């Protein structure tokens, strides 16, 4: 989408995975989907260094709406859970230097059953712009035809444009097309700043494996379309929650950097371990994810329960990730000729290699003839940056 | 097995899950199966508090043997990886106050392809006894006849008996029966101190779930068989390795306590986080696992992606574990009438409830009519101890 936005993958926080559709503010005031939850997350995004690290968009997912539209047929936030309304929440979020994301659905209802936007695309776009919304996640539930799906996503894209406000447009279009018809990613990128390709992530290593495996299986179709203004979205970062071991969290961070993925955390910023916070705020890894060239990485190799992924960066640098998919035993040795990396240019005539994950360690100079040797933890990842000596 | 051993579930360390069959001591010296590894592991078991916590058996799994038997037809340790031999390793282990476990196979070869014990049961038992072995893990590979399997396990049990040395006898008999017919656990318990029921564990939450689900599915068949001298073995503790989140590690520790399981760690004691070590050395949870009553726990309830397990303890106490199997979202509230716990006996007329996991916290007195309310993390477990009481 050539709206001047998302020139690097969008970074921020999205409530869905950790907080979902919790409406029980009477029994669970601190966890329910409410204005107070987003105020608390905004405060911590400022005070705990998230904004400084680049996490900029505080995003509302499903279950913010009132059961019905208002007198004039516009969407409204739930009166009890969002007493001051979305425009006021956006004002607050802006006063902190952050941006606000909101959620709507292309069909007749949202996935959780709240008012859909079909028939209201232009009014909804104008409502969002009037409210000061900075990002829209547009879901695909309750849409009875591929034509309605495509037409709605394009119509909403154009309506957002017509409001004149800069609004990041996040689409689930491909995900809802894939069971029936192969998506045309050139068209999608024409209309969207990023697009969900695959099933919702949850708090599990199985989910991560399945997302990585889908991305590597389909990489010939999706890798080259990505770039400044339009990214593949493999769904939220779930680092800092409950289901991932430390090495599995490292794998998610490293490979979301390799994939030039949007970095939408879905966690509780009020209760997050120092280790998870340091991983999610890792300057060098974020810098890889945010590389201005915006060329998505890809899987280079797979075999012996090892995977090698790599990503070209600005200024002749490369990022390389090595995953150990064997879920038994101990750290496993993996070696690869550096001439096999970076299409044969990264280390010609030589390169300096720095390991970034699981810990930052300079590895030294590697000549064109050299072999890179590493030990990779089960379900963990070794992430490296290669700098050509020219 | 009525050998006076394993009156509580055996506790120790077994190399299989973490170190497997790594034979490459030149390229992977720190991971290969060698005498130096077991010597160092013994030193750390002493110095890092593992022996004090109750972990007593340092156990060798597969891939310790030389490719062939010796001139006298007895087994021998690998010449390069175990130059000083099993007798000397056992001397070292005993000098640290620990006990040594070893591995053999009922069939013609071990699962990794090394000499099997079939045809040599009595001499192999005697060899182990001469070496000073204190525990035998007896595998079931390369034995495709049910009669051979059963006869071999019984024979090895009797042969170990004849040596006159006290040796814990750990069997994989039931697991190897399933391709043919489901086991008679009365017979197995007659011959074994504990027995593997289900597929090998690996370093994953998937594996933990599958072991728990098999145990609860088959619990009417295996729970009452267990007791002092004979335990169900759901395989090694893998806390301290790589594939389990903190809450998944807590779930494994809590439920291995519930199940009266042998506690065999399979990790690297040289590289283990403080948090994992504190969990594995948790005095109160170990005390649940080691409860002298020796009655295995069971799944009480299951529904809405929640599980409730409980285990009766000595002196009218109970352990209760609540698992959240929903792998999305945040901590989920679960409430239960305390009268539903411990068969209505734990809290009659009252009980004092102490949460032990994920953190230790006194919850207070709960009267027989009261309700217990708790919050459980995704893939985590809340482990509680109920003490029957007449007071407030
Ligand atoms: C080879 O097999 C034989 C037969 O199975 C086995 O002999 C058995 O040894 C056990 C353990 O020593 C004996 O059990 C003991 O019996 C005495 C006398 O009745 C009791 O006083 C003992 O009670 C104490 O220990 C128990 C734990 O075992 C506790 O439950 C109890 O509270 C006491 O602390 C204990 O019951 C058993 O009687 C014999 N059986 C026979 C038939 O002789 C022998 O040990 C095996 N070989 C080797 C090397 O162990
Ligand atoms: C509406 O769409 C137009 C057309 O794509 C966008 O115009 C582009 O804006 C970028 C950034 O300002 C320029 O670099 C391009 O040259 C423009 N292209 C064209 C064809 O005009 C415009 O930014 C969009 N406006 C909003 C508010 O989204
Ligand atoms: C995928 O969609 C793109 C964009 O809608 C199609 O490309 C356009 O094709 C028309 C007609 O040939 C050209 O005039 C435009 O210049 C193209 N637009 C762009 C942005 O390239 C493309 O044909 C579609 N591909 C398939 C296989 O259907
Ligand atoms: C919404 O419902 C109407 C009436 O049932 C239907 O005609 C229309 O196609 C639906 N729209 C979508 C996108 O499913
Ligand atoms: C199980 O084994 C015991 C002891 O050997 C024996 O007495 C019993 O009959 C067996 N049960 C069945 C059902 O075969
Ligand atoms: N992919 C389906 C989408 N619908 C849910 C909201 O109800 C989340 O936004 C999820 O990402
Ligand atoms: N269940 C199969 C058994 N065989 C392996 C050794 O090769 C492990 O001991 C495992 O416990």
Author numbering:
A (entry chain A): 32 to 421
B (entry chain B): 32 to 423
Quote what the paper states about this structure.
Previously, the dibasic iminosugar and potent α-Gal A inhibitor 5 having the (2R,3R,4S,5R) configuration pattern demonstrated good chaperoning activity in cells transiently transfected with various mutant α-Gal A.23 Notably, iminosugar 5 exhibited superior pH-dependence in its inhibitory activity compared to its monobasic parent molecule, 4, suggesting that it binds to α-Gal A at pH 7.0 more effectively than 4, leading to better enzyme-stabilizing or chaperoning activity. Surprisingly, in the compound 5-bound structure of α-Gal A, the positively charged exocyclic amino group (exo-N, pKa = 9.1) of 5 forms bifurcated salt bridges (BSBs) with residues E203 and D231 of the enzyme at pH 7.2, where the carboxylic side chains are essentially deprotonated and negatively charged. By contrast, the corresponding C-2 hydroxyl group of 4 forms H-bonds alone to E203 and D231 at pH 7.2. This finding most likely reflects the stronger binding affinity and better protecting effects of 5 toward α-Gal A at pH 7.2 compared to those of 4. In contrast, the titration curves revealed that the endo-N moiety in compound 5 exhibits reduced basicity (pKa = 5.5) compared to that of 4 (pKa = 7.0) due to electrostatic repulsion between the vicinal ammonium cations,34 which implies the formation of an H-bond between endo-N of 5 and D170 at pH 7.0 but a salt bridge at pH 4.5. Given these structural findings, it is conceivable that the pH-dependent protonation states on the amino groups of iminosugars and ionizable residues in the catalytic site of α-Gal A regulate the binding status of the compounds, i.e., the stronger binding of 5 to α-Gal A at pH 7.2 is due to the formation of the BSBs, which are missing at pH 4.5 when the binding is weaker and only H-bonds are formed.
